[PDB]
Amino acid sequence: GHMEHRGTDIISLSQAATKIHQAQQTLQSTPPISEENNDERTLARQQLTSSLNALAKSGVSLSAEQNENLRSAFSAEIWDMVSQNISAIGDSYLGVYENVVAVYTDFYQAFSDILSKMGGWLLPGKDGNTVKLDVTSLKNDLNSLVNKYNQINSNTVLFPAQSGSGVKVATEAEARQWLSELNLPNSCLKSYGSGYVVTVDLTPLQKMVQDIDGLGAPGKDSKLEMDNAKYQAWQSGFKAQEENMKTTLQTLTQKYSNANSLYDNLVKVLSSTISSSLETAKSFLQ
């Protein structure tokens, strides 16, 4: 125990610092908006975990204070506990949030694509005080989106994260915990086979379709002639529902960001611990 090995400690600590910094760069730069991006993020966390596994085996020494920092933050042996703890947070918390954003991203794009058609569904009325709305084309497109995202598959499931040809499901209790965590309405909790899933919120779309039927029966052309005031009042209601979906997506992306920030704060604790150890290896008390 009397012979030092600063050279090898410097190499081992440097190696770990580098891998941790690379994983951090990935997790701060790569948005969780596609399967491909999330694969990159998951790989970055694997690279971090592996680096801590290697560091644990390297025999670098921790001071009492560094030891304590690690125990406190993550509540050879110490590094294995740290690796286990951060791995759980990455897989079970951050990785679920990443799936939530990617799934919602594509859903919301599908909605955006319908909004892009609305211009063509609003025509001149019989005179300057009236309009003609293609209520049939609009309702059909919304109902189609509802139908698509009312299914249970990888396009629709927020939790659990999906992969392979089955449907991964959770216990009701675990699913409700995520429902609460995500601040989603109760309609998002769905039974599937032996368990439960959490899916996208269709309620504003369904409300839109209801308000369309509320305007009254279309004419012979499947379109609805409307006085300007009535159209304006309907448009206000439609926008309100668009706002609801926008708000939902916003909550979810902010919560993802905070999950990513929580993981990053742990990474900072790692980097600071390793940096302090590197100073120790380089320092000579006179």
Is the C-alpha dihedral spanning 64, 70, 71, 77 positive or negative? negative
* Token output for 263: 């993981």
Nearest residue by C-beta to Ni ion?
2
Residue 1 Cβ vs Ni ion, minimum distance, rounded to whole Å: 4
DSSP 8-state code for residue 284: -
Is the C-alpha dihedral spanning 259, 260, 266, 268 positive or negative? negative
Residue 5 Cβ vs Ni ion, minimum distance, rounded to whole Å: 11
Q: Which of 181, 190, 32 is nearest to 106 (CA)?
A: 32
Among 2, 64, 129, 166, binds Ni ion (CB under 5 A): 2
Nearer to Ni ion, 1 or 120 (CB): 1
Nearer to Ni ion, 3 or 229 (CB): 3
Residue 268 Cβ vs Ni ion, minimum distance, rounded to whole Å: 34
CA atoms within 13 A on the CB side of 44: 27
Nearer to Ni ion, 8 or 250 (CB): 8
Nearer to Ni ion, 6 or 117 (CB): 6
Residue 62 Cβ vs Ni ion, minimum distance, rounded to whole Å: 18
Is residue 64 within 8 A of residue 267, CB to CB? The reply is no
1 makes contact with Ni ion (CB under 5 A): yes
Dihedral over alpha carbons 40, 41, 45, 51 (to 10 degrees)? 40
Nearer to Ni ion, 1 or 128 (CB): 1
Residue 3 Cβ vs Ni ion, minimum distance, rounded to whole Å: 5
Residue 58 Cβ vs Ni ion, minimum distance, rounded to whole Å: 18
* Token output for 10: 């410097």
Nearer to Ni ion, 5 or 190 (CB): 5
| Binding-residue pattern over the window 234 to 263 for Ni ion, x denoting contact by CB under 5 A | ------------------------------
Q: Which stretch binds Ni ion (CB under 5 A): 1-9, 66-74, 93-101, 219-227?
A: 1-9
Nearer to Ni ion, 2 or 220 (CB): 2
Residue 154 Cβ vs Ni ion, minimum distance, rounded to whole Å: 57
Distance CA 53, CA 47 (A): 10
The per-residue b/e assignment along 159-169, b for 16 or more CB within 10 angstroms, e otherwise, is: bbbbeeeebeb
Phi, psi of 103 (to 5 degrees): -65, -45
Is the peptide bond preceding residue 160 cis, with omega within 30 degrees of 0? yes
Q: Which stretch binds Ni ion (CB under 5 A): 2-10, 54-62, 146-154, 208-216?
A: 2-10
- What residue ranges bind Ni ion (CB under 5 A)? 1-2
